């Protein structure tokens, strides 16, 4: 670049003091404002799993205790008596869900974007995709980083470095440093208090915030496996909730559950077609003593069509179902009160970051890890073989999550054509006693006998979509280290540039699992 | 963009030559096809080895092996073969090499043959430059390994021919000879060739010797040797005892200076690198360097600035060849007489390369200077990497062992005392500027420098003696940092300057299985 200019970054506020107070081993103790600021994230985690997990909890008293001036050094979490912190924060839930308003937050939000949230790069006008400093907080990882519970210390001006332009003003702020990069293409740059990492602002619609937000994304997935049990506990407990918007809510959050079904309103062509939750009419359902049916023709002409088994569903399932059919025309939308937003709302307050298209990314990441898992490994002679484990476990997850698409247009003469591909080498190995010649036609027919078995399979489905959508590519680079062979030629160009992250990620959480034996 | 690109493609392998060999499966004699023996013959080249007693390394290769045999044996287990035969053919013509190699009948020729190929296949013009092309010899056939765990180990490695090969090559450049499968004139790649492995499915390139692609591959390459060094240790070590036995005196001289390697991590001495080229090596120890005495032998070596370096070997439970073969070479010398006279890195690495195929005095070094540090940060309780600067302090202790491990001693830095001293005044202030502190801003921007302080003085007296910088650069597995900063969370890129994050850019990629399941045991 030539030149550079923004306003720097946005730090956080200053934490407010509420003057309150803890008890340990039955004394009460004032906290002064960093014991109080550390007390309230705490206590904000009261109602999460984090808090009950022993590595978290010694990790947080390591930065907690540390601030009691060498008393308390040997208290564990159990004698801490946090009611009054877990008091203020309820006090302060209610009031945040009371007040339905004074909206003048939305001029100093508004204020904060138009100051920090544009840069100017050699004459044209760029929007910054991280330009708020997070403010300090209890550190986590997707489950098992050896540094959950430890404290994030605040973080201020003095610490970041700024890249600007030389004839760019320098904005207000007590930076660190000033560099005049015309190299890179970064704007801040700070190392994490806490990991030794280095933080980095860069540009919206760049390389490497585009990276970042992608694995974000795959990360939240691999949360989820450690809390989809007290998902689904919550998602039941909806369906029981006296108030209708909620059992309504909860109902289209089973069917993403239960049959990967999206919400509906999402405009991707790749899945604009689909079956979602807000195009399913009373004509598409049928309740039966035994099963919930559902029959859903698309734009396309692609009749979908799966069943649920009622036998071991519990029984608000097939309560909240009738309750919004009841007194429909057969076309009438069933979910008249539903949209992505309050389906995440409802997701993201069991987990936060939750949303539809993180759980269906851990579903269909599941399904083709569960699919790979059970091959034998013996089983794998191949590259081609194990493209062709690779791409059933694909293709599981495209019937799943409802890719159903079209037949390609000549499906039909295109399998004889390789049934007669088939044929044709079948014997033209039979004719040729030189083993050299008889070993590459020997590879040639493999391939297109495994060819012709995926091109049978395949015909009703759109694999791309979840292979660049909802498939952690962890899984595929762990298959590939699992077993030996070429993992990156299941993707095409597009999608190795897409998911260059997985290059450097770690794959040892599939690997684990691949490995178990 | 290239705009022209010439070369000549790639060289293939030669044909295997069949020996009529048969073997025995199940009492029943089979006589072996080409392919089959060709096989066999591999296997037979592994006998006196772990690998073949490597129960996934043994189905892996019967998956292909029985293959050959279409409709017969696709049942038999390795314990129903008999290899001998195949056994005794390679024992037979392994001691015909026992005779003459390093004379004039495989010297000249053998030579000369080799830089004919050079000279045909080596160089290529790019945008009408020459340059040396890296790898242009396609591998022959044979047994698939990796680093020891890998799970296609034992498999086959298909012979690849012309006709699997595309070259890379300019839209009027001259078409070299053999059956290619494709040409292809892609200014936007800078591979001269490519092929599918046929058992990995991994993409094979072709690249110029100026190259990232190569300076990495060949990087990463030594320090993959190393890690597999790990399982063939105490293999090596016999061969080196049997070396000392040897009855060939230039023989025995070498295993003298490989058993340095393995007990000192002693260079071999003939490296010019500037690095190295003022510590101890095999072949600048003098008589006086070394008192022989009844139970032990003492190394005393005095260098450049004065630097005396010391170490010594209980010879006690060692072999009684070492002490054999260290008077043999006192014998008749006097003092300022050099011990190794006849020792150089091509012999020495002949030698090592014979008990281990690629092994080397640098793999060798790099193998025991990243087993000490890997042992090192193993040690360390996970509740004593208490932050950034605590981590980076600890991989720098272990960075120490390994330079006092491989002899990389030097005179203390010139103004060490005062330089000394002056950090035990900044760290005394800091201090007191800690307890004098306010705000809770200011308690910890002190607190932060003040913790670096102490632990960077700690150091400084440490390190005193010893160049870190040379193991880190050269013998230290890179994964091992890496791993470290994965077990603890902390940020291991700290731990090198940004010329070495370029040397190490491979290990982003790499995995660092093999180490992290250590620290996690
Ligand atoms: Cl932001
Ligand atoms: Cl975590
Ligand atoms: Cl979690
Ligand atoms: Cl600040
Ligand atoms: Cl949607
Ligand atoms: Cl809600
Ligand atoms: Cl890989
Ligand atoms: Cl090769
Ligand atoms: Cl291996
Ligand atoms: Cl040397
Ligand atoms: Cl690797
Ligand atoms: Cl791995």
Redesign the pocket.
Known sequence: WRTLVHNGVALPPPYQPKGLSIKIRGETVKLDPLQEEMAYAWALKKDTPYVQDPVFQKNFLTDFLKTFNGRFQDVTINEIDFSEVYEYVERERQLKADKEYSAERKRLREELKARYGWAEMDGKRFEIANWMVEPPGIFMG??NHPLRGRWKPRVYEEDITLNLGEDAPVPPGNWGQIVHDHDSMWLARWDDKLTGKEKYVWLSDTADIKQKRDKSKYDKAE?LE??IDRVREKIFKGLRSKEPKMREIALACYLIDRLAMRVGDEKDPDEADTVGATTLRVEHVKLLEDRIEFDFLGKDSVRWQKSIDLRNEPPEVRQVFEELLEGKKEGDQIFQNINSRHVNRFLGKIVKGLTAKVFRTYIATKIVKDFLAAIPREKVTSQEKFIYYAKLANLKAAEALNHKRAPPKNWEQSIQKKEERVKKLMQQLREAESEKKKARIAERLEKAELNLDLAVKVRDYNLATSLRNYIDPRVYKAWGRYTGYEWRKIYTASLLRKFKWVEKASVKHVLQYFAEK
């Open positions: 997707r489950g949360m450690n809390h």
